[PDB]
Amino acid sequence: DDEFEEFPAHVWEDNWDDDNVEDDFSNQLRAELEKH
Amino acid sequence: LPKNPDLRIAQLRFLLSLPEHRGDAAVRDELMAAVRDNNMAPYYEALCKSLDWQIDVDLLNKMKKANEDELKRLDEELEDAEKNLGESEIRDAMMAKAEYLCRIGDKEGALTAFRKTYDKTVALGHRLDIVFYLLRIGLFYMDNDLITRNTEKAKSLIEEGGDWDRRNRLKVYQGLYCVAIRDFKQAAELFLDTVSTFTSYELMDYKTFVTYTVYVSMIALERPDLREKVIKGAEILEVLHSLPAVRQYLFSLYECRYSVFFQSLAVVEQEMKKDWLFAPHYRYYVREMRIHAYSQLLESYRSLTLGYMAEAFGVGVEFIDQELSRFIAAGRLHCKIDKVNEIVETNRPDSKNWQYQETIKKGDLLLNRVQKLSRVINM
Amino acid sequence: LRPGRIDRKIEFPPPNEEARLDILKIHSRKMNLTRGINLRKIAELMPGASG
Amino acid sequence: MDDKALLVEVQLLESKTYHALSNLPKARAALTSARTTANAIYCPPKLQATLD
């Protein structure tokens, strides 16, 4: 068909929430139980 | 089938290639024991290159010479078979050679030899065995392209004629690959279909396979299917008697005991970070299981106070507030927080409202397709 | 039974353990047989048995 | 070999261990095998009571 040449040119379905950087859940829960 | 290569080798190597676990020397002793036993000079060289290890020339030379002599004698036997024996034994000679290349760790040579053996051989069973060796090499080296190509080859062979035993072994291979590529739904299906007849002891012992089935089933199956096929599974309960922690995890989720559930999920996260096949899935799996626990708790409530949620999950109130806010913002929970007077309202959609929204979405998709087709054709 | 009315007469003896192996294969084709299962042994175990 | 009474007792123990391990279908299979073997020999009152 037409080409817009006039404008120059993990197998996964990854998610945004996966890119967050935070401590391991084990560490988080350990700290929570420790302080409560 | 034989352990070739022992995927325990890859497990040890990966588990070693991790911070805070390098040079514990137990992993190193195990891996060196196996490498010396099977005379893996090339894999040893690759490991030294990867991990920047003090190469022991004294033993490396011995392994090299043993491997060279083995290769030469195998090749001489193969040539003798060509000169005297017929195809029926020439195939066995090539097959044994390729097996030895896999044992030592000559990846490309082993693949070439197996391709030649596959081309030569006509027996359907031996073709399946070759394809399964290729699939095991693919799993060992985590080359997704080879793994998928040989999975398709195995499926094509089974359609062209196969048997129940190879069908189950292929099912276990497919489930392992799905777990590798984060397809926990299909992994759950395959693992539960092959749980009662696990024969592939070359990949992992029945206990490890059952732990994988439990984990994948918990993350992929709804509550009814989970109760019907895991909590009421004879062959899973039989092994969970031996495994007391996996049982506590699964039953803490099922019996709505959530503090114990988070404890078990933390230990599962650690175990499954250490694991080699699930390693690039521990964050996602923990997140999804936390979302499942939150949705399960809120499934039977119209307004749940944050204090009660925190006490139920054995955490603080800030922790639950932060997690709930994150997942609601991401769109994974049907609940709205209310912090001035801490309460978690439950805005689940009615059946008719959900039906209307689904109709809007599907109709929008279909109407876009119809519009595109009409504009393509009317001109 | 006179020829011309019944020109040919075909007897159907019970299978001779080789026909029995054949029948076992025919009727087990649509079946999930485990490895190490010996339809030849079953055929031997079935003497004088019909299809 | 012989001592089908001992065979019945061992099959009953297999069924009982399956029941204790929660593998109920296998426990029932072992029980049915034990009953099939038991209804071919003399079952003393104790063995019959255990089977029942």
Short mmCIF file of C-alpha atoms in Angstrom, two decimals:
data_model
loop_
_atom_site.label_atom_id
_atom_site.label_comp_id
_atom_site.label_asym_id
_atom_site.label_seq_id
_atom_site.Cartn_x
_atom_site.Cartn_y
_atom_site.Cartn_z
CA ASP A 1 0.00 0.00 0.00
CA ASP A 2 1.06 3.61 0.52
CA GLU A 3 4.19 4.21 2.60
CA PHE A 4 4.72 7.41 4.56
CA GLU A 5 8.35 7.68 3.47
CA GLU A 6 7.84 11.45 3.77
CA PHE A 7 8.37 10.76 7.48
CA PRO A 8 11.92 9.40 7.94
CA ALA A 9 12.05 6.06 9.74
CA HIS A 10 11.93 -10.44 27.13
CA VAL A 11 9.18 -12.27 25.23
CA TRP A 12 6.86 -10.91 27.86
CA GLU A 13 3.86 -8.62 28.13
CA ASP A 14 5.65 -6.59 30.77
CA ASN A 15 3.82 -4.05 32.93
CA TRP A 16 4.71 -0.60 34.23
CA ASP A 17 4.47 -1.68 37.86
CA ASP A 18 7.29 -4.19 37.26
CA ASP A 19 9.85 -1.40 36.81
CA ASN A 20 9.41 0.02 40.33
CA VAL A 21 12.50 -0.16 42.54
CA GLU A 22 11.84 -1.14 46.16
CA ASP A 23 13.16 -3.51 48.79
CA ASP A 24 12.41 -7.22 48.63
CA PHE A 25 9.00 -8.12 50.01
CA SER A 26 10.71 -10.37 52.56
CA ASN A 27 12.69 -7.38 53.85
CA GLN A 28 9.62 -5.13 53.87
CA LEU A 29 7.53 -7.65 55.81
CA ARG A 30 10.41 -8.36 58.19
CA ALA A 31 10.70 -4.66 59.02
CA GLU A 32 6.93 -4.39 59.41
CA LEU A 33 6.71 -7.27 61.88
CA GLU A 34 9.82 -5.96 63.64
CA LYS A 35 8.31 -2.53 64.26
CA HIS A 36 4.83 -3.89 65.06
CA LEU B 1 15.55 -40.33 29.82
CA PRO B 2 19.08 -39.46 30.96
CA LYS B 3 20.38 -36.38 32.73
CA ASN B 4 22.27 -34.72 29.89
CA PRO B 5 23.22 -32.14 31.00
CA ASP B 6 22.11 -32.41 34.62
CA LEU B 7 20.02 -29.24 34.93
CA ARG B 8 21.23 -29.23 38.52
CA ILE B 9 24.46 -28.01 36.90
CA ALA B 10 22.75 -24.92 35.50
CA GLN B 11 20.92 -24.46 38.80
CA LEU B 12 24.22 -24.42 40.70
CA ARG B 13 25.90 -22.12 38.18
CA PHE B 14 23.08 -19.57 38.26
CA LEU B 15 22.72 -19.74 42.04
CA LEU B 16 26.46 -19.08 42.18
CA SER B 17 26.27 -16.14 39.75
CA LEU B 18 24.47 -14.02 42.33
CA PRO B 19 25.64 -11.40 44.86
CA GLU B 20 25.68 -12.25 48.57
CA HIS B 21 25.98 -15.90 47.53
CA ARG B 22 29.28 -15.96 45.61
CA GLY B 23 31.96 -18.13 47.15
CA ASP B 24 29.83 -19.72 49.85
CA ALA B 25 31.98 -22.69 48.71
CA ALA B 26 29.20 -25.26 49.20
CA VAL B 27 27.75 -24.44 45.79
CA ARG B 28 31.31 -24.33 44.44
CA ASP B 29 32.17 -27.72 45.94
CA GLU B 30 29.03 -29.29 44.48
CA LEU B 31 29.59 -27.82 41.02
CA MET B 32 33.28 -28.74 40.96
CA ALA B 33 32.43 -32.27 42.09
CA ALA B 34 29.97 -32.68 39.23
CA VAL B 35 32.30 -31.07 36.68
CA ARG B 36 35.21 -33.30 37.70
CA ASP B 37 32.98 -36.38 37.69
CA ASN B 38 31.67 -35.76 34.17
CA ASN B 39 34.94 -34.27 32.83
CA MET B 40 33.39 -30.99 31.67
CA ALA B 41 36.55 -29.24 30.51
CA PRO B 42 34.76 -26.87 28.06
CA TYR B 43 32.00 -25.94 30.50
CA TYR B 44 34.68 -25.43 33.14
CA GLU B 45 36.50 -23.05 30.81
CA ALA B 46 33.26 -21.18 30.13
CA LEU B 47 32.55 -20.89 33.86
CA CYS B 48 36.06 -19.59 34.51
CA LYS B 49 35.63 -16.98 31.79
CA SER B 50 32.22 -15.95 33.14
CA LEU B 51 33.01 -15.75 36.86
CA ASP B 52 36.71 -14.72 36.66
CA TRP B 53 37.94 -17.74 38.60
CA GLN B 54 41.44 -18.93 39.48
CA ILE B 55 41.91 -21.62 36.84
CA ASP B 56 43.46 -24.81 38.23
CA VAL B 57 45.72 -25.80 35.34
CA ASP B 58 46.74 -29.08 36.99
CA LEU B 59 43.21 -30.52 36.94
CA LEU B 60 42.12 -28.61 33.83
CA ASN B 61 44.81 -30.39 31.81
CA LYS B 62 43.63 -33.77 33.09
CA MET B 63 40.03 -32.99 32.15
CA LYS B 64 41.12 -31.75 28.72
CA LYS B 65 43.13 -34.89 28.03
CA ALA B 66 40.34 -37.19 29.22
CA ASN B 67 37.82 -35.39 27.01
CA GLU B 68 40.17 -35.43 24.01
CA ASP B 69 40.83 -39.16 24.37
CA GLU B 70 37.11 -39.87 24.77
CA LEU B 71 36.28 -37.83 21.67
CA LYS B 72 39.01 -39.50 19.61
CA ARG B 73 37.95 -43.02 20.59
CA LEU B 74 34.27 -42.25 19.94
CA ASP B 75 35.15 -40.84 16.51
CA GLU B 76 37.32 -43.87 15.72
CA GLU B 77 34.47 -46.21 16.67
CA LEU B 78 32.13 -44.14 14.48
CA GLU B 79 34.52 -44.42 11.52
CA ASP B 80 34.83 -48.17 12.09
CA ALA B 81 31.03 -48.43 12.09
CA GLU B 82 30.88 -46.53 8.80
CA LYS B 83 33.55 -48.72 7.21
CA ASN B 84 32.07 -52.05 8.38
CA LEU B 85 28.64 -51.72 10.01
CA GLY B 86 25.43 -50.41 8.48
CA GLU B 87 23.18 -47.45 9.14
CA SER B 88 21.51 -49.11 12.13
CA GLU B 89 24.79 -48.96 14.09
CA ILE B 90 26.24 -45.84 12.47
CA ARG B 91 23.25 -44.00 13.93
CA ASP B 92 24.03 -45.36 17.39
CA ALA B 93 27.67 -44.31 17.01
CA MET B 94 26.73 -40.75 16.07
CA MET B 95 24.11 -40.66 18.84
CA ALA B 96 26.59 -41.72 21.52
CA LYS B 97 29.10 -39.17 20.23
CA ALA B 98 26.52 -36.37 20.46
CA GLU B 99 25.55 -37.50 23.95
CA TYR B 100 29.19 -37.26 25.01
CA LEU B 101 29.50 -33.77 23.52
CA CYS B 102 26.50 -32.72 25.61
CA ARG B 103 28.01 -34.33 28.70
CA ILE B 104 31.30 -32.45 28.30
CA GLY B 105 29.62 -29.15 27.42
CA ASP B 106 30.41 -28.65 23.72
CA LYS B 107 27.16 -26.89 22.91
CA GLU B 108 27.51 -26.09 19.20
CA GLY B 109 29.20 -29.39 18.39
CA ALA B 110 26.46 -31.29 20.22
CA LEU B 111 23.74 -29.42 18.32
CA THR B 112 25.45 -30.12 14.99
CA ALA B 113 25.88 -33.81 15.83
CA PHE B 114 22.25 -34.08 16.92
CA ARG B 115 21.07 -32.39 13.73
CA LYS B 116 23.07 -34.93 11.72
CA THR B 117 21.67 -37.81 13.78
CA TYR B 118 18.12 -36.49 13.37
CA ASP B 119 18.60 -36.20 9.61
CA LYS B 120 19.99 -39.73 9.38
CA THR B 121 17.56 -41.52 11.69
CA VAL B 122 14.11 -42.61 10.54
CA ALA B 123 12.76 -44.35 13.66
CA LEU B 124 10.03 -42.17 15.14
CA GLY B 125 10.95 -42.95 18.74
CA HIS B 126 14.60 -42.08 18.17
CA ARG B 127 13.56 -38.88 16.40
CA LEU B 128 11.56 -37.97 19.51
CA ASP B 129 14.54 -38.80 21.72
CA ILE B 130 16.77 -36.52 19.65
CA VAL B 131 14.20 -33.72 19.82
CA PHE B 132 13.99 -34.15 23.59
CA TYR B 133 17.76 -33.93 23.92
CA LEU B 134 17.62 -30.71 21.90
CA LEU B 135 14.85 -29.40 24.17
CA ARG B 136 16.90 -30.22 27.27
CA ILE B 137 19.93 -28.44 25.82
CA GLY B 138 17.64 -25.51 25.10
CA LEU B 139 16.36 -25.44 28.67
CA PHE B 140 19.91 -25.76 30.02
CA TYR B 141 21.23 -22.84 27.97
CA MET B 142 18.02 -20.76 28.08
CA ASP B 143 18.02 -20.15 24.32
CA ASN B 144 14.37 -19.33 23.77
CA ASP B 145 14.64 -19.63 19.98
CA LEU B 146 15.99 -23.18 20.06
CA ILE B 147 13.58 -24.16 22.84
CA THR B 148 10.51 -22.98 20.93
CA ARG B 149 11.69 -24.42 17.61
CA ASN B 150 12.28 -27.84 19.16
CA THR B 151 8.99 -27.64 21.07
CA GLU B 152 7.22 -27.14 17.75
CA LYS B 153 9.27 -29.99 16.29
CA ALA B 154 8.23 -32.30 19.14
CA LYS B 155 4.57 -31.35 18.78
CA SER B 156 4.76 -31.96 15.03
CA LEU B 157 6.33 -35.37 15.64
CA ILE B 158 3.65 -36.31 18.18
CA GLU B 159 0.97 -35.33 15.67
CA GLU B 160 2.85 -37.39 13.06
CA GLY B 161 2.71 -40.27 15.54
CA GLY B 162 3.70 -40.45 19.18
CA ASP B 163 2.94 -42.19 22.46
CA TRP B 164 1.68 -41.30 25.92
CA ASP B 165 5.09 -41.35 27.62
CA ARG B 166 6.65 -38.87 25.21
CA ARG B 167 3.45 -36.82 25.38
CA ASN B 168 3.83 -36.42 29.14
CA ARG B 169 7.54 -35.68 28.93
CA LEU B 170 6.79 -33.02 26.31
CA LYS B 171 4.07 -31.64 28.59
CA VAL B 172 6.58 -31.26 31.42
CA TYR B 173 9.05 -29.57 29.05
CA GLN B 174 6.34 -27.18 27.84
CA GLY B 175 5.37 -26.38 31.42
CA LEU B 176 8.98 -25.69 32.35
CA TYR B 177 9.36 -23.36 29.37
CA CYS B 178 6.12 -21.57 30.25
CA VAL B 179 7.37 -21.06 33.80
CA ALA B 180 10.58 -19.71 32.28
CA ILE B 181 8.76 -17.22 30.04
CA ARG B 182 6.13 -16.22 32.63
CA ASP B 183 3.08 -18.01 31.21
CA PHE B 184 1.94 -19.26 34.59
CA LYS B 185 -1.56 -20.01 33.27
CA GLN B 186 -0.37 -22.55 30.70
CA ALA B 187 2.28 -23.73 33.13
CA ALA B 188 -0.47 -24.46 35.68
CA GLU B 189 -2.51 -26.31 33.08
CA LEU B 190 0.37 -28.52 31.94
CA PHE B 191 1.72 -29.14 35.44
CA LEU B 192 -1.66 -30.14 36.83
CA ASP B 193 -2.35 -32.34 33.81
CA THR B 194 0.98 -34.14 34.32
CA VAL B 195 1.17 -34.10 38.13
CA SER B 196 -0.26 -37.59 38.66
CA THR B 197 2.15 -39.13 36.11
CA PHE B 198 5.42 -37.28 36.56
CA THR B 199 8.15 -39.36 34.90
CA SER B 200 10.73 -36.72 33.90
CA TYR B 201 13.08 -37.19 36.84
CA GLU B 202 15.99 -35.85 34.76
CA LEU B 203 14.73 -32.27 35.11
CA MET B 204 13.79 -32.20 38.79
CA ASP B 205 12.63 -34.49 41.56
CA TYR B 206 8.93 -35.00 42.17
CA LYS B 207 9.07 -32.76 45.25
CA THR B 208 10.46 -29.82 43.27
CA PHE B 209 7.94 -30.45 40.49
CA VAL B 210 5.12 -30.44 43.04
CA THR B 211 6.37 -27.19 44.56
CA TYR B 212 6.38 -25.65 41.08
CA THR B 213 2.86 -26.96 40.43
CA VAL B 214 1.64 -25.50 43.73
CA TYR B 215 3.21 -22.10 43.11
CA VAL B 216 2.03 -21.81 39.52
CA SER B 217 -1.45 -23.10 40.39
CA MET B 218 -1.79 -20.58 43.22
CA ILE B 219 -0.84 -17.70 40.94
CA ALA B 220 -2.91 -18.88 37.94
CA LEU B 221 -6.05 -20.62 39.27
CA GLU B 222 -9.19 -19.10 40.75
CA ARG B 223 -10.40 -20.22 44.17
CA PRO B 224 -12.84 -22.91 42.91
CA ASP B 225 -10.36 -24.54 40.54
CA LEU B 226 -7.67 -24.27 43.20
CA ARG B 227 -9.82 -26.11 45.72
CA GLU B 228 -10.88 -28.76 43.20
CA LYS B 229 -7.43 -29.47 41.75
CA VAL B 230 -4.84 -28.57 44.42
CA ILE B 231 -6.42 -28.46 47.87
CA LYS B 232 -8.36 -31.63 46.98
CA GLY B 233 -5.56 -33.15 44.90
CA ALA B 234 -4.57 -36.59 46.13
CA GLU B 235 -1.09 -36.71 44.59
CA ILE B 236 -0.36 -33.12 45.64
CA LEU B 237 -1.46 -33.62 49.25
CA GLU B 238 0.61 -36.80 49.42
CA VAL B 239 3.78 -34.83 48.66
CA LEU B 240 2.73 -31.78 50.67
CA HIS B 241 2.77 -34.05 53.70
CA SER B 242 6.52 -34.33 53.13
CA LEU B 243 6.73 -30.62 52.27
CA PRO B 244 5.45 -28.75 55.36
CA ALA B 245 6.17 -25.19 54.19
CA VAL B 246 4.57 -25.36 50.74
CA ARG B 247 1.50 -26.83 52.41
CA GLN B 248 1.40 -23.97 54.91
CA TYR B 249 1.66 -21.47 52.05
CA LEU B 250 -1.13 -23.03 50.00
CA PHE B 251 -3.48 -23.61 52.92
CA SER B 252 -2.80 -20.20 54.44
CA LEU B 253 -4.08 -18.74 51.20
CA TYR B 254 -7.03 -21.13 50.89
CA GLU B 255 -8.25 -20.90 54.50
CA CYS B 256 -8.07 -17.09 54.50
CA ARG B 257 -5.26 -16.99 57.07
CA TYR B 258 -3.45 -13.95 55.75
CA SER B 259 -0.68 -13.19 58.26
CA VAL B 260 0.62 -16.73 57.84
CA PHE B 261 0.07 -16.25 54.11
CA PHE B 262 2.41 -13.26 53.93
CA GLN B 263 4.98 -15.13 56.02
CA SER B 264 4.81 -18.04 53.59
CA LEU B 265 4.92 -15.66 50.62
CA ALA B 266 8.09 -14.01 51.94
CA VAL B 267 9.78 -17.38 52.33
CA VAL B 268 8.53 -18.34 48.86
CA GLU B 269 9.99 -15.12 47.46
CA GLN B 270 13.38 -15.97 48.93
CA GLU B 271 13.28 -19.58 47.74
CA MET B 272 12.16 -18.56 44.26
CA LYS B 273 14.71 -15.78 43.92
CA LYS B 274 17.36 -18.40 44.68
CA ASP B 275 15.71 -20.70 42.12
CA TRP B 276 17.13 -20.51 38.60
CA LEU B 277 14.01 -21.04 36.47
CA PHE B 278 11.78 -18.61 38.40
CA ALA B 279 14.56 -16.09 39.08
CA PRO B 280 13.27 -13.41 36.67
CA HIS B 281 9.76 -13.74 38.10
CA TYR B 282 10.03 -13.32 41.87
CA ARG B 283 9.05 -9.64 42.00
CA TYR B 284 6.12 -10.18 39.63
CA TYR B 285 4.96 -13.34 41.40
CA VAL B 286 5.08 -11.72 44.84
CA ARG B 287 3.20 -8.70 43.52
CA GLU B 288 0.53 -10.84 41.88
CA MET B 289 0.08 -13.01 44.96
CA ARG B 290 -0.24 -9.92 47.15
CA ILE B 291 -2.89 -8.60 44.76
CA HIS B 292 -4.65 -11.96 44.90
CA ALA B 293 -4.67 -11.89 48.70
CA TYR B 294 -6.03 -8.34 48.78
CA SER B 295 -8.75 -9.10 46.24
CA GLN B 296 -9.63 -12.27 48.15
CA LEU B 297 -10.01 -10.38 51.43
CA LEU B 298 -12.09 -7.64 49.81
CA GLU B 299 -14.24 -10.12 47.87
CA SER B 300 -16.50 -10.57 50.92
CA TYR B 301 -16.65 -6.99 52.18
CA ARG B 302 -18.36 -3.75 51.19
CA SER B 303 -16.39 -1.50 53.55
CA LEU B 304 -13.24 -2.82 55.25
CA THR B 305 -11.43 -0.68 57.81
CA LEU B 306 -7.69 -0.32 57.33
CA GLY B 307 -7.05 -1.31 60.94
CA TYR B 308 -8.84 -4.61 60.38
CA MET B 309 -6.99 -5.21 57.12
CA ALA B 310 -3.64 -4.53 58.78
CA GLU B 311 -4.43 -6.82 61.71
CA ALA B 312 -5.62 -9.56 59.34
CA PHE B 313 -2.47 -9.36 57.21
CA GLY B 314 -0.19 -8.96 60.23
CA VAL B 315 1.28 -5.64 59.07
CA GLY B 316 0.98 -1.97 59.93
CA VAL B 317 -1.57 0.51 58.66
CA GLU B 318 0.89 2.55 56.58
CA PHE B 319 2.02 -0.64 54.83
CA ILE B 320 -1.51 -1.65 53.86
CA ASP B 321 -2.39 1.92 52.86
CA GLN B 322 0.65 2.18 50.58
CA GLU B 323 0.11 -1.23 48.99
CA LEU B 324 -3.59 -0.63 48.43
CA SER B 325 -2.96 2.81 46.95
CA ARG B 326 -0.32 1.41 44.59
CA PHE B 327 -2.51 -1.43 43.35
CA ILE B 328 -5.65 0.71 43.03
CA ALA B 329 -3.67 3.26 41.03
CA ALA B 330 -2.34 0.44 38.85
CA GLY B 331 -5.96 -0.71 38.46
CA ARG B 332 -5.56 -4.16 40.01
CA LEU B 333 -8.02 -3.74 42.92
CA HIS B 334 -11.68 -2.70 43.04
CA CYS B 335 -11.54 -0.57 46.16
CA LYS B 336 -11.18 3.09 47.11
CA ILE B 337 -9.35 4.19 50.24
CA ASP B 338 -10.63 6.86 52.62
CA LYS B 339 -7.86 8.11 54.88
CA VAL B 340 -9.46 10.89 56.94
CA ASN B 341 -11.45 8.10 58.59
CA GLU B 342 -9.47 5.05 57.55
CA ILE B 343 -11.88 2.85 55.57
CA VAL B 344 -11.54 0.86 52.35
CA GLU B 345 -14.77 1.12 50.38
CA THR B 346 -15.37 -1.63 47.81
CA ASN B 347 -16.50 -0.29 44.43
CA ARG B 348 -16.97 -3.62 42.66
CA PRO B 349 -19.00 -3.23 39.44
CA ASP B 350 -22.48 -4.69 39.21
CA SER B 351 -23.07 -7.54 36.79
CA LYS B 352 -25.01 -5.34 34.36
CA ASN B 353 -22.48 -2.51 34.64
CA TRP B 354 -19.63 -4.91 33.89
CA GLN B 355 -21.59 -6.34 30.96
CA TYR B 356 -22.19 -2.84 29.59
CA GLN B 357 -18.50 -1.96 29.86
CA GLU B 358 -17.47 -5.21 28.16
CA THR B 359 -19.97 -4.55 25.38
CA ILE B 360 -18.52 -1.06 24.92
CA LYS B 361 -14.96 -2.37 24.72
CA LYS B 362 -15.65 -5.28 22.37
CA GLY B 363 -17.96 -3.19 20.21
CA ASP B 364 -15.34 -0.47 19.95
CA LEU B 365 -12.79 -3.01 18.75
CA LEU B 366 -15.18 -4.60 16.25
CA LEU B 367 -16.40 -1.20 15.04
CA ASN B 368 -12.84 -0.03 14.44
CA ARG B 369 -12.26 -3.17 12.37
CA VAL B 370 -15.51 -2.63 10.45
CA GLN B 371 -14.64 1.01 9.79
CA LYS B 372 -11.19 0.07 8.50
CA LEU B 373 -12.61 -2.64 6.24
CA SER B 374 -15.34 -0.37 4.89
CA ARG B 375 -12.91 2.43 4.12
CA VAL B 376 -10.52 -0.04 2.49
CA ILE B 377 -13.20 -1.48 0.22
CA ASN B 378 -15.56 1.41 -0.58
CA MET B 379 -12.65 3.01 -2.44
CA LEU C 1 -24.72 -74.27 0.73
CA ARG C 2 -24.76 -75.58 -2.84
CA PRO C 3 -22.20 -73.83 -5.08
CA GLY C 4 -23.78 -71.36 -7.46
CA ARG C 5 -25.91 -70.08 -4.61
CA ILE C 6 -23.06 -69.80 -2.09
CA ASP C 7 -20.05 -69.82 -4.39
CA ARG C 8 -17.47 -69.31 -1.63
CA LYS C 9 -17.39 -70.12 2.08
CA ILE C 10 -15.04 -68.12 4.31
CA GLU C 11 -14.17 -69.49 7.74
CA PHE C 12 -13.27 -67.08 10.53
CA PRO C 13 -11.14 -69.02 13.01
CA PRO C 14 -10.39 -67.34 16.32
CA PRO C 15 -7.17 -65.35 16.07
CA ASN C 16 -3.89 -67.29 16.30
CA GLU C 17 -2.13 -64.90 18.72
CA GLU C 18 -0.81 -62.91 15.78
CA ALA C 19 -4.26 -61.82 14.74
CA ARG C 20 -4.73 -61.28 18.48
CA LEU C 21 -1.73 -58.95 18.65
CA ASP C 22 -3.14 -57.17 15.59
CA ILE C 23 -6.57 -56.79 17.22
CA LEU C 24 -4.99 -55.53 20.44
CA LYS C 25 -3.13 -52.87 18.47
CA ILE C 26 -6.27 -51.97 16.52
CA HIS C 27 -8.41 -51.51 19.63
CA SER C 28 -5.68 -49.87 21.74
CA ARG C 29 -4.64 -47.31 19.10
CA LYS C 30 -7.03 -44.78 20.70
CA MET C 31 -5.63 -45.33 24.17
CA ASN C 32 -3.01 -43.88 26.49
CA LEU C 33 -0.81 -46.94 26.89
CA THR C 34 2.02 -46.60 29.39
CA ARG C 35 5.59 -47.42 28.41
CA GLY C 36 6.74 -50.97 29.00
CA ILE C 37 3.26 -52.33 28.24
CA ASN C 38 3.45 -55.54 26.20
CA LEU C 39 0.45 -56.24 24.01
CA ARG C 40 2.34 -59.34 22.86
CA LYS C 41 2.25 -60.61 26.45
CA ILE C 42 -1.47 -59.86 26.62
CA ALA C 43 -2.01 -61.70 23.33
CA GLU C 44 -0.18 -64.73 24.73
CA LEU C 45 -2.28 -64.51 27.89
CA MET C 46 -5.37 -64.72 25.67
CA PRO C 47 -5.43 -68.20 24.07
CA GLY C 48 -8.34 -69.10 21.84
CA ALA C 49 -9.93 -65.70 22.46
CA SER C 50 -11.99 -64.07 19.73
CA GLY C 51 -11.69 -60.52 18.44
CA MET D 1 4.78 -66.40 46.18
CA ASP D 2 2.82 -67.87 49.09
CA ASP D 3 1.45 -66.46 52.38
CA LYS D 4 -1.42 -64.63 50.75
CA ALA D 5 -2.48 -63.76 54.30
CA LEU D 6 0.74 -61.77 54.65
CA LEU D 7 0.10 -60.28 51.21
CA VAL D 8 -3.36 -59.16 52.38
CA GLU D 9 -1.92 -57.63 55.54
CA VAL D 10 0.75 -55.77 53.56
CA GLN D 11 -1.79 -54.48 51.03
CA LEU D 12 -3.99 -53.32 53.91
CA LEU D 13 -1.02 -51.49 55.40
CA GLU D 14 -0.37 -49.87 52.01
CA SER D 15 -3.98 -48.69 51.87
CA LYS D 16 -3.77 -47.42 55.44
CA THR D 17 -0.58 -45.44 54.74
CA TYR D 18 -2.20 -43.90 51.65
CA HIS D 19 -5.19 -42.91 53.77
CA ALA D 20 -2.84 -41.33 56.32
CA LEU D 21 -1.00 -39.51 53.51
CA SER D 22 -4.34 -38.26 52.07
CA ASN D 23 -3.92 -40.04 48.70
CA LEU D 24 -7.45 -41.34 49.01
CA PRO D 25 -7.85 -42.84 45.50
CA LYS D 26 -4.65 -44.84 45.94
CA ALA D 27 -5.73 -45.89 49.44
CA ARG D 28 -9.00 -47.15 47.97
CA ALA D 29 -7.15 -48.95 45.18
CA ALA D 30 -4.90 -50.69 47.70
CA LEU D 31 -7.94 -51.58 49.82
CA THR D 32 -9.74 -53.07 46.83
CA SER D 33 -6.66 -55.08 45.89
CA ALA D 34 -6.43 -56.34 49.48
CA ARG D 35 -10.10 -57.34 49.49
CA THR D 36 -9.76 -59.10 46.13
CA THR D 37 -6.79 -61.09 47.44
CA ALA D 38 -8.56 -61.74 50.76
CA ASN D 39 -11.66 -63.22 49.14
CA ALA D 40 -9.51 -66.10 47.88
CA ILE D 41 -8.09 -67.48 51.17
CA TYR D 42 -9.07 -68.07 54.78
CA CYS D 43 -9.33 -64.74 56.59
CA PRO D 44 -9.06 -65.24 60.37
CA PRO D 45 -11.46 -63.14 62.46
CA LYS D 46 -8.71 -60.60 63.19
CA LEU D 47 -7.78 -60.17 59.52
CA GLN D 48 -11.43 -59.94 58.49
CA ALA D 49 -12.03 -57.33 61.21
CA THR D 50 -9.02 -55.31 60.05
CA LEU D 51 -10.22 -55.45 56.44
CA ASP D 52 -13.74 -54.43 57.46
#
